[PDB]
C-alpha cells in the first residue's frame, strides 16, 4: 500500500521537523541575577 506508506512518512517527517524547529526556537538559559 504505497498510499499508506506515503501518508505515514509525511506525518512522521512533519512531526519530527516540528520537534527540531521547536527546540531550535528556544533561547539559551541565563541567570537574570548576579
Amino acid at each position: 500500500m504505497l498510499t499508506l506508506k506515503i501518508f505515514v512518512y509525511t506525518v512522521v517527517t512533519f512531526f519530527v521537523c516540528l520537534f527540531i524547529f521547536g527546540f531550535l526556537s528556544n533561547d539559551p538559559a541565563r541567570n537574570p541575577g548576579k
Binding site: 504505497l2 506508506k5 506515503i6 512518512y9 509525511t10 517527517t13 521537523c17
Partner: peptide
C-alpha cells in the same frame, strides 16, 4: 526512494512558505 521524495517535499514546502 519514497523517503527521499517525501523529505524533499516537506522541507521545500516549509522553506517556500517562509521565502
Amino acid at each position: 526512494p519514497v523517503l527521499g521524495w517525501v523529505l524533499l517535499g516537506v522541507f521545500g514546502t516549509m522553506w517556500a512558505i517562509w521565502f
